[PDB]
Structures are given as structure tokens and as C-alpha cells.
């Protein structure tokens, strides 16, 4: 029962970042706090190519991107403007099969975590 030291015991390495494919559905804020508790951050998306890879491994996940309301711009948890386009009362982002979807923040949805 051995593992790559850089990541924890049940996580995966991919491109200089660890991943937890979560398998428990949670609210957006519940996912965020869930990941931070595990000493990392809710799924962030860097490239379009990461996205395609992540779409092989799991169909749906919250990503760390949000709005206060219908129109202020989409914001990351690093405090930046989210430069990838994302598709009523939907103020939190979710990655669902190689697309960025708007979703109601109170929906229970699968969440992944990712390391810098």
C-alpha cells in the first residue's frame, strides 16, 4: 500500500498537481470548505486541456468560480476574473462533461479538490 509522497494516500497525480475525485455530492460552499479542510482547494481549472482530461475521469464537478449575482463577472477563489466562458438563479460554476455550466449554488453536486 505505497504511494507517491508528493500527494496524500488516496489521491492522484497528473500535471504537477494532486487530485481528489470526491464521489460525495455537496453544496458549492460545502464543497469549498470540504476541500480546504483536506488542506487544498476546490477544483480549479487552468487550461481547456486539463478540462478534457478531467472529463474522462469524472462527468460532473463544482469548480472554484462564482458570482454574487446574475451580473457581476465570474470570479475565482484566487481573486481573479475567470477567463473561460461558462454557460435563472445560477451563481456558481460546475464542470459537466468538457463544458463549464452555471448551476444553483444550493444543488448537491460532486466536488473534486486540487493542489498547487
Amino acid at each position: 500500500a505505497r504511494h507517491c509522497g508528493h500527494c496524500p494516500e488516496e489521491w492522484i497525480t497528473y500535471s504537477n498537481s494532486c487530485y481528489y475525485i470526491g464521489k460525495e455530492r455537496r453544496t458549492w460552499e460545502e464543497s469549498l470548505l470540504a476541500c480546504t479542510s483536506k488542506n487544498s482547494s476546490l477544483l480549479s481549472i487552468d487550461n481547456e486541456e486539463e478540462m478534457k482530461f478531467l472529463s474522462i475521469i469524472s462527468p460532473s464537478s463544482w469548480i472554484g468560480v462564482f458570482r454574487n449575482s446574475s451580473h457581476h463577472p465570474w470570479v475565482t477563489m484566487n481573486g481573479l476574473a475567470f477567463k473561460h466562458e461558462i454557460k435563472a438563479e445560477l451563481n456558481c460554476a460546475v464542470l459537466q462533461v468538457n463544458r463549464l455550466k452555471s448551476a444553483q449554488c444550493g444543488s448537491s453536486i460532486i466536488y473534486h479538490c486540487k493542489h498547487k
Partner: protein, 123 residues
């Protein structure tokens, strides 16, 4: 070391995995993995691809029939456990095995094109 795994292979339980997007024949898959200095997936148990358990894709794995041993074997020569795939009784011995990280194996014409998974051990 355990933290090998090219760039863009996935590392898990001190193994490295390559999950294809490209679809190839069972033999072509076998050689591509061999060209990457790895083997077509040998499954030691289903939890091995837990990280990918949501997939609804079938992937060629490294299991083929041996007329000599009257049994299905991995590419390294080690035997299949009976409990791993319970339908194995009914696998057609001229076919190759495709596998869904779900837990479901299907025997299929080896000349069918499928995605494939390569795996490197590390010890």
C-alpha cells in the same frame, strides 16, 4: 520513487496510468503501451481504477486467452482470479476483453477499435 509517470500520465497507488482518447485495435494498443515502456492494463482488483469509477467507457485491458493453459492470462503471464470477472466462464476464447471502470468486463473481437489503458508498475 513512486512519483515517476511522464507528463500527463496519472499516478495512483505508486502506479502510473495512461487513459487513451485514441481508439485502436487490441494488438495496436498492446504495442503502443509497449512503445511507452508499459503494459496494457493488468487489473489486480477493481479498486485499482477507483479514481475513474464514474467512467462509462470501455477500455481494452491486458487479458488474452492461452490455448496452452486453457485459461485467461495477463500479458506478464500471471493468471486471472476467478472472482475478478465472474462471467469469465462465458468469455469467447477467440475474443479480447474490454473493461469499464464501473466493474463490467466484455469480451469483444480483438480487431474492434477501443480506447486502451497502459500501466507501469513501480517496485
Amino acid at each position: 520513487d513512486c512519483c515517476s509517470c511522464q507528463e500527463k500520465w496519472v499516478g495512483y497507488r505508486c502506479n502510473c496510468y495512461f487513459i487513451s482518447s485514441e481508439q485502436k485495435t487490441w494488438n495496436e494498443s498492446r504495442h503502443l503501451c509497449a512503445s511507452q515502456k508499459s503494459s496494457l492494463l493488468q487489473l489486480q482488483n477493481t479498486d485499482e481504477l477507483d479514481f475513474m469509477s464514474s467512467s462509462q467507457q470501455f477500455y481494452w485491458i491486458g487479458l488474452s486467452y492461452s490455448e496452452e493453459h486453457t485459461a485467461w492470462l495477463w500479458e506478464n503471464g500471471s493468471a486471472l482470479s476467478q472472482y475478478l470477472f465472474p462471467s469469465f466462464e462465458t468469455f469467447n476464447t477467440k475474443n479480447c476483453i474490454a473493461y469499464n471502470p464501473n466493474g463490467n468486463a466484455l469480451d469483444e473481437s480483438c480487431e474492434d477499435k477501443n480506447r486502451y489503458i497502459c500501466k507501469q508498475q513501480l517496485i
